Design a protein around this ligand. Structure first.
Ligand SMILES: NC(=O)c1cccnc1
Ligand SMILES: [Mg+2]
Ligand SMILES: [Mg+2]
Ligand SMILES: [Mg+2]
Lengths: 181, 371, 371, 371, 371, 371
C-alpha cells in the first residue's frame, strides 16, 4: 500500500586504488567468482522457497545444504561475514570509515544508492517505513518493490551504528566516486 | 526448541531467552544468611537468602561469593543460585529447553566436569553447551579479526583471534579484577578515616566506585592540579544520611590498572601485557591487530579508560603504525548478547551434546571438544 | 582452436593463450594448509589454499613447494595447482584445446610419463606436446645459431645450438639458484642479528632480495670502500614497521654466483662453466659463440650482472677476441612469450600428439620426440 | 643532649630517656572533671585531675579519654596532657630535646599533621622523628625477619617484615581491644546481677580483669567442667568491702578474641587475621615467617595465650611446617624499650626533622617521609 | 702465569684455571634489585644481589637475566657478574693471566666487539683468546671426527666436524631451549590448577622440572597408560610445605623437543634437524658421521633421551648403517673441561692475542681469525 | 746396482725391480689439497695429500690428475709423486741405480726433455734408459711379427711390428679412454635420476663401472631384450648405504667404444682404426697379423670384448682369413712385466745413457736413440 525509497551512503576501502581501479575495471567493483544476475535472483529466491534446483558454485551449494531449515537469513548473514577467501560471491561495505580490514593507507570510495527495505518472517517481505535497524534481526534490501528486477540485492546486518551492507550484484563506477580518506 | 541462556559471572548473573536482545533479569550472584536469631513468632523466615533478597536484609546478613576469579568454590551454594534462577525469575522448567553456559579461557578441567555432570543429572535438561567467554564477545562486534580484551568482576585475560583461528600460545591471564580495586579503595578512604569493614560495608563502597570514579589522562599533572584546585572534589551521602567527601582519590583508583606496583601486584599493567601478547604473535599479523581492538566487561565501563590505553600503546609505539580502539556502548551486556545470536544459528543442532550421548560417553568427552 | 601454453617453474607458473603477448596469469607456485583448528562456527574453512590466498593468509599457514630443482615430489598438490589455474584463473575448460608443457633440459623420464598420463586422463585434452625450455627462450631472439644460459628458481643449465642443432655433449648443469641465495642471505642477516626463520619470514627475505640487492663491479675494492663509508648502507621497513639496515651484504650475495666456494658448492662460477662448455665445442665455433651469448631467467634480472660477466670472461680471455652479451629487457617473461609464438606455428599441428595416438603407442613415443 | 621519647596510648602514657631500660613514668591516660559542686570555701578546686591524681578523686568525677583507637578528639586537652607530662611527670623542660612519637600502622593523616604543627609551634623543639610501633617492637629482639602482633586497650594490628623491607599491602588492622572485653564482662556480670555502671566501676572491672582472669585452652571443655564445679571460682574484695566471686566469667572473656561473633562483631579473630596476612604474603617468605613470630602488649599478658595461639595456627595448619612464638617476659614495656634502644642509635641524626625544615616545608614533608 | 677459563651460559657461569678438572665455581647468572622501600634504620641495604645471594633473598626481589639466547641486553649488569666472579669466586686478580672466552656458534659481531673492548679496558689483561663451544666439547673425547649436538639454557645448535675441519655451511641453529620448556610446564600445571606466576615461582618451576620429569619411550602408549593408572603420579613438596602431584605432565614436557608443534614453534624437532644436517654433508662422510655422535649440555641430562634419539634417527633409516650415541658422564662440565684441556696445550702461546696487538690493530683482527 | 722400473699412467703408477713378476706398489695417480680451513689445534695438517691417503680423505678434498693422455701439466706436483714413490713406496734411494722411463708412442718431445732433465739433476742417477711401451708390450709374448693393443685411463693405441723392425707410419693412437666412458656413464645415470656430480662421486662411478658393467654381443638385440626384461638388472650399494639399480646401462656403456658418435666424438670406432693401421701393410704381412693380434690393458678386462672385436673385424673381412687375439691373465701388469724382463737382458748395458754423457751431450743424444 506504499512505495517509498530511502538513500544510503557507503564506503569501500580497497587496494584497487581509484585511478587504477577505474583504469582496469570498466565495470567497477565485483566479486571474485560472481554469480549471474539470474542465478543471484534464484539464490535470493531460495530464502522464500522453491529451492528444488541449484545452478551455482558448489561450495555455496554445500553452505545452503547446511541450512536445511527455513530461516536461512541468519546463517547466510553469519557465513557471509566470516568467510573471507576468493570463494566468496559478494562485496562488503562499511558505513563509517571504520572498516574491519586494512582500513588504513587504502583509499576510500563513496557510493550512493536508493533502495527499498524489508524485514522477513520467513515467508513474506514486509514494509518498513520505520526501518527497525536497531533490533539485531537482519534486514534485506531490494532495487524494486519485488524480487524480479534483481538489479541489486543487498542486505544489512550488524548493530545500528557499526552497520555493514553486502551485495550479490555489481557496483559499477556509475554509482561510485573517489572519496576523502 | 527455544534455547535458554544463563551466565556465570563473578559479580552479576544475567538471564535470557534465545532470540532476545536484552536479558530479562540481572541480579547479584550472592548468597546470604542472617547474622542474628530473630524473635517474632511465626515470621516464617527462610533458611537463607540469595540475590535480590540480600539487598533488602543487608544489615542482618552475611555474604559469600561462590565465585573466585575463574573458579567455583562452593558447589552447594553455587547450586542454590541456579535453582533460584529458573523457578523464580524465569518460571520455566529445564528439560523443556536447551541451556547455554560460559567459561573463562583457561581453567582447570575439573570445573567443566562438575558443571557438566550436575546439569544432566540434577536438572534433567535435554541439552547443554559450553562456550569460551572471549570468543562470544567477538560475535557482538562481528569483525573477522580483532584482539579481544576482557576484564570482568574476577579475571583479566587476553585472546587474539585472526580470521577465525585462535592462537593458544598467545593467550595471557592476569588476576587483577574488581575485587582488588575495591579492597584498594577501602584503604584510601581509610586515609580520611571512615570505618568500613565486613562485606555489607564493602558493597556500599562499590556504588561510589561505580558512580564517581574516573581515569586520569596524566596521573602526575592531574594529581598536582587536584592538590591546588577544589573543583575536582566531590561530596556524597550515605544511606544513613552521613555525608562523605573525596579528593585526589577519585582518580587514584583507575591508576591501579596501569601500575599494579601501587598495590604491589607485579604482572605488568594491562597495556604492557596487551603489547606483549601481540609481540608474541608472528611478525605478519601484528599490523592487522592494531587495526582492530575490542574491550568488554564491567571494568571497562569507567569514563576515559580508552583514552589512556591509546596513549600507552602509542608510547610503546610498536611502530609508526595506526592504532585504534573500538569501545562500543552496552559493553557490559555484550558478552551475554553474543550468546543469543549463537543459540539461534542452525549449525549448533550438530553441536548440542545430548543427554543420551553423555550417558553413553561419560564426562571425558565434554572437555575434549575444546580447550 | 587456440591451443594452450603452460609453464612449470620452481618459482612462478605461467599460462597463456596463443596470440597473447603477456602472460594471462602469474602467481607464486605454493600450496598451504592450516596450522590451527579454527573455532568460529560456520566459518566454512577450506581444506587447503593455493597461490595468492596463501600470501594473504600467510601468518596462519605452513607452506610447501611442490618442486625441487626440476624434480617433483608431491603429484597431487601439483595437480591442485593446475586445477586452480584453469578453472579460476583462466575460466576456460581444458578439453577445448591441446596443451603444451615445459621441462628443463635434462630430467628423469618418469616425470614426463606422469605429466602425460595425468594430462590425458584427468583433463580430457585432445592432444599434448612437451618442449625444452632453452629452445623456446631462444625463439625470443630467433637467431639460428645460439648459445643459451638459463638460471631459474631451481636450475642453471647450458645448451649451445648451431644452425638449429644442439650438441648433447655440450650439455652442462649447475644447481645453483635463488634458493641458495636466500639461505645465504639469511645467514648474512644473522650477522647483524635479526631473526628470520620459518617460511613466512623466508618470503619477506625474498622481497628484500628483489628490491635492495645489487652486483659489485669489484668485490675487493667495493668492500674496502664500504668498510670506510656509510654511503652504501640502505634502510628498509618490514610489514611490522620494524626497520632494517644493510651493509656489505648487498653486494656480498650476488658474489655467490661468481664464487660457489662461499656456499661450499664446487662447480665453478657461472662464467667458468660457460667458458668450459664452449671449450667442448669444435675449434671453429668458439669464435662464433663468443660473438653472441644469451641469458634468461629471474636470477639474471639483477642490475649490472652482465657487466661483471663481460669483464670476467674478457679476463679469462679464451682469446684476444671481442666479447658480447645478449641480455634483453623483460627477460623473465621471455620464456613464456617464446612459448606462445612457437605454439602459434602451423607445424605444431603436425607435432600435437593425439590421445588416440598416445593410446596406440603408449607413453614412450612421447619421450621419443626429442631428448 | 639526651633526647626524649614519648608515647601516646588510649590507656597508658610513657615517657623516657635514651639509655633507660625501664620507663620513667607510667600513668593512666585519663582526664577527669568534677560531677558535683564541692562545698568548702576557698578550697581552690582545679578544673581537672589526671592520672593517679584523677584516680584519687575518682568518685567525684566524670571521665574522658582524648583519644580513640588511634584518633585524637580534643587537641587542646590532649595538649594539656602533654603540658602536664613535660613539666610535672619528668621534671625536665621539653624544649631541651628532640622527640620521638609513635602511631598505629594505619591512621588518618590529620593526626601526624596536628601533632607536628602543635609540637613545633607550642613547644619549639629543635628536631623531630616519628616511629611506628611494629618496627620498634621488632627491635626488642632485633631479628631481621619478623611478623608482629600487638593488641592494646584500643587497637589490634599485625605487620610482617622481612629483612628490613616492609610489605605495604600485607599490613592489616583490627579495632578489637580490651575495652570490648570490658563491656562483655560487664554484661555477663549484669547477668549474675552485681551492679556495675559508670567509669569508676569500669576501672574496677579493669582491675578485676587483670587479676582474676585467665585463658581457656578449649572453651567447650572449659565450660563443661566449670558448669559442674565451683572449684574454678575465685573470690575478691571490693573497695566497698563488698566481695566478689567469679565462675564461667573467668575464662569466657579471653575466649572472645577467638570468636568475635560472641559480641556480634564479624572481622575474624586476630589469629585468623594474622594467618590471612601470611597467606597474603609472597609464597616464598611464608615459611620464614612461620619461622619467627612476635607477640606484644597487654592482651598478650594473659596466662597461656601462647598455647592457644599455637593450637589455633596449627589447626589452621597452613602446612605441616614449624611455627614458633617469641613471648618474652616484660613484654608490656618492650615497645618503649625498643624505642629507647633505637633512639640511642647514631643514624637517627639523619632522621630528626628540624623545626626549621618544618617551617620551610610545612607539615606535608613529615607525612611524606614514610607511611 | 696460569691462564683463565671462563664460561657464559644463560643459566650457569663457570670459571676455571688451566689444569683444573672441575670448575671452581658455578652459579646462576642472575641479577636482582629491590622491589620495596626498606624500613629498618642502619640496615645498609645494597643496590643489588647476584648469584646465591639473589637466591637467598629471592622472595623480596625481581629478577633479570642479562642474556638472551646468545645476546646481551644490559652490559653493566653482565659486567657486575664478571666483577663478582673474579674478585669473589676466584679471589685472583685479572691482570695476572691471559683469558679464554666462549661464544655460541653464530652470534652478531657486536658481542665479540664488546667482550674484547671491555676485557681489555676494564681488566687490563695481558692477552686474550675467543673459542667456539662445539670444538671445545669435541676435545672432551678427542675423537678426530665428530658430530656434535648441544642444547643449553638458551640455544640448540649442531656442528659436524671431520678430521679437524669444520664445514661452515652445515652449521644449524635452533632457538628451542629450557626457557620454553619452563613456560610450557607452567601452562600445563595451570591446567591442573596450581598457581604459578612471577619469576620467583619460575625458579621453583625449574627445580620441579629438573627433579620429576623424564622422557617417554613411546608417547602414545605412555599417555594411554597414564590415562588408566594412577600409579604413575608422583608428589613433591614446595618451600611453602604445600604439596604437589603430577601426572601426564611428566612425559608430556620432554615430548616438546621432538614436536615443537605442541608449543607452536615450527623448526622441526631436533632429531629431524640432526638428520638433515648430516644429509646436507657430502655422500662419503655420512657413513662416518652415523658412526660417531656426541651429546653435550644440560638438556641432555634427562633420563632415556639417548634411547629415543637413537630409535628415532634409526627410524628415519638413511640406510642399513650402524648408529651410535656417546653420552659420557659429567656431560654438563664438558664444555668447560675442553676449554681447560685446550688451554693447557703448548700451541696456545701462538693463539693468545695481546692487549698491545689489539691496541695496534683495533678490534677487527680479533674477529678475523674466525666467525 | 739393481735398476729401477717406473711407469707413467693417468690412473696408476707402478714401480719395479728387475726380476720381480709383480710390481711392489701400485696406487692411484692422484694429488689433492685441502678445501677447508681446519680448526683443531695441533692437527699438523699437510699442504697436500697423494694416493691412497687421498682416497681415504676423499670427501674433504679437491682432486687433480697431473697427467693427461700423454702430457704432464704440473711438473712440481708430478715430481712430488715421484718423490713419494721412491721414498715412501719403494724405500730405496734413487741415485743407487739406473732408471727406466716410459712414454706413449706419440707425445711431444718436451716430455722426454723434462723427464731427462729432472731425473739427472734431481736424482743424481748413474745412467739412464728410456723405453717405449708398445715394444715392451710386444715382448710379453716375444712373437716376431705383431700388432698390439693397449688401452688405459687416457689413451688407446695400436702398433704393428714385424720381425723386429718397426713401421713408423703404421703407429696409430686414439685418445678415447675410460674417462670418456665415465662421462657417458654419468649421463645415463642421470637418465634414471640419481644425482652424481663432483670428483668424490666420480670415483664411485669408476668403481661401479668396473664391477657392474659388461659388453653386449649385439647392441640392438640386447637392448630389445633388456627393454622387456628385469632379469638383466643388478643392484649395488654406495659407501653411503644408499642403493642403486641398473638396467640397460650395464651393456650400454662398453658399446660406446665402437660408436663414438654417441658421445659426439667423431674419429671412427677403434676396430676400424686398428684395421686401417693394418691396411698400409703388404697383404702377406697383413695376413700374418690377421692370424694373430694381441690386446692388453684395463679396457680389455671387460667380459666378451674379444668376441666383439673378432666379429666386427670379421664383418669388415679384410679377407677370408683366420683372426685371433691373445689376452692372457694379469694382462694389466704386462707392460711392467715386459719392462722387467727386458731390463734383465745383457744388451741394455749399451742402452744406458750415463749422467756424464748427458751432461756432455745435453738431451738431444737421449732423443737420438729412438723416436
Ligand atoms: N574495504 C572495505 O571498506 C570493507 C568493508 C567491510 C568488509 N570488508 C571490507
Ligand atoms: Mg597500646
Ligand atoms: Mg651452555
Ligand atoms: Mg695405461
Amino acid at each position: 500500500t506504499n512505495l517509498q525509497k530511502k538513500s544510503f551512503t557507503l564506503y569501500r576501502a580497497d587496494n584497487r586504488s581509484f585511478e587504477e581501479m577505474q583504469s582496469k575495471f570498466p565495470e567497477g567493483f565485483k566479486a571474485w567468482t560472481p554469480l549471474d544476475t539470474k542465478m543471484a535472483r534464484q539464490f535470493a529466491s531460495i530464502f522464500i522457497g522453491q529451492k528444488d534446483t541449484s545452478n551455482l558454485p558448489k561450495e555455496t551449494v554445500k553452505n545452503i545444504s547446511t541450512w536445511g531449515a527455513k530461516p536461512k537469513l541468519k546463517d547466510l548473514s553469519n557465513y557471509i561475514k566470516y568467510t573471507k577467501d576468493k570463494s566468496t560471491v559478494w562485496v562488503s561495505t562499511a558505513i563509517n570509515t571504520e572498516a574491519g580490514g586494512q582500513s588504513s593507507g587504502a583509499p576510500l570510495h563513496k557510493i550512493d544508492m536508493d533502495l527499498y527495505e524489508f524485514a522477513i518472517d520467513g515467508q513474506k517481505l514486509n514494509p518498513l517505513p520505520e526501518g527497525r535497524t536497531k533490533n539485531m534481526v537482519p534486514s534485506l534490501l531490494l532495487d524494486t518493490p519485488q524480487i524480479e528486477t534483481s538489479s541489486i540485492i543487498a542486505l544489512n546486518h550488524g548493530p545500528v551504528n557499526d552497520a555493514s551492507i553486502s551485495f550479490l550484484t555489481t557496483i559499477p563506477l556509475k554509482n561510485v566516486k573517489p572519496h576523502k580518506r | 526448541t527455544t534455547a535458554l541462556v544463563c551466565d556465570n559471572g563473578s559479580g552479576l548473573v544475567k538471564a535470557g531467552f534465545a532470540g532476545d536482545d536484552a536479558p530479562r533479569a540481572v541480579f547479584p550472584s550472592i548468597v546470604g544468611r542472617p547474622r542474628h536469631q530473630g524473635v517474632m513468632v511465626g515470621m516464617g523466615q527462610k533458611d537463607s537468602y540469595v540475590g535480590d533478597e540480600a539487598q533488602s536484609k543487608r544489615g542482618i546478613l552475611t555474604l559469600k561469593y561462590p565465585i573466585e576469579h575463574g573458579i567455583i568454590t562452593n558447589w552447594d551454594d553455587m547450586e542454590k543460585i541456579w535453582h533460584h534462577t529458573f523457578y523464580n525469575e524465569l518460571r520455566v522448567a529445564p528439560e523443556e529447553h536447551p541451556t547455554l553456559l560460559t567459561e573463562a579461557p583457561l581453567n582447570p578441567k575439573a570445573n567443566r566436569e562438575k558443571m557438566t555432570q550436575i546439569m544432566f543429572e540434577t536438572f534433567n535438561v535435554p541439552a547443554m553447551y559450553v562456550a569460551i567467554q572471549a570468543v562470544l564477545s567477538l560475535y557482538a562486534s562481528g569483525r573477522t579479526t580483532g584482539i579481544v580484551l576482557d576484564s570482568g568482576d574476577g579475571v583479566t585475560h587476553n585472546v587474539p583471534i585472526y580470521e577465525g583461528y585462535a592462537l593458544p600460545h598467545a593467550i595471557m591471564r592476569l588476576d587483577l579484577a574488581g575485587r582488588d580495586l575495591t579492597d584498594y579503595l577501602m584503604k584510601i578512604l581509610t586515609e580520611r578515616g571512615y570505618s568500613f569493614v565486613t562485606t555489607a560495608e564493602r558493597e556500599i563502597v562499590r556504588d561510589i566506585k561505580e558512580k564517581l570514579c574516573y581515569v586520569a589522562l596524566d596521573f602526575e599533572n592531574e594529581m598536582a592540579t587536584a592538590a591546588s584546585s577544589s573543583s575536582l572534589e566531590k561530596s556524597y551521602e550515605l544511606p544513613d544520611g552521613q555525608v562523605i567527601t573525596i579528593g585526589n582519590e577519585r582518580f587514584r583508583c583507575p591508576e591501579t590498572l596501569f601500575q599494579p606496583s601501587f598495590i604491589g601486584m607485579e604482572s605488568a599493567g594491562i597495556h604492557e601485557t596487551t603489547y606483549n601478547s601481540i609481540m608474541k604473535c608472528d611478525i605478519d599479523i601484528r599490523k592487522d591487530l592494531y587495526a582492530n581492538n575490542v574491550m568488554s566487561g564491567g571494568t571497562t565501563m569507567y569514563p576515559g579508560i580508552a583514552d589512556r590505553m591509546q596513549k600507552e600503546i602509542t608510547a610503546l609505539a610498536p611502530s609508526t603504525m595506526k592504532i585504534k580502539i573500538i569501545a562500543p556502548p552496552e559493553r557490559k551486556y555484550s558478552v551475554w548478547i553474543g550468546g543469543s545470536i549463537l543459540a539461534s544459528l542452525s549449525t549448533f543442532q550438530q553441536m548440542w551434546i545430548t543427554k543420551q550421548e553423555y550417558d553413553e560417553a561419560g564426562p571425558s568427552i565434554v572437555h575434549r571438544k575444546c580447550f
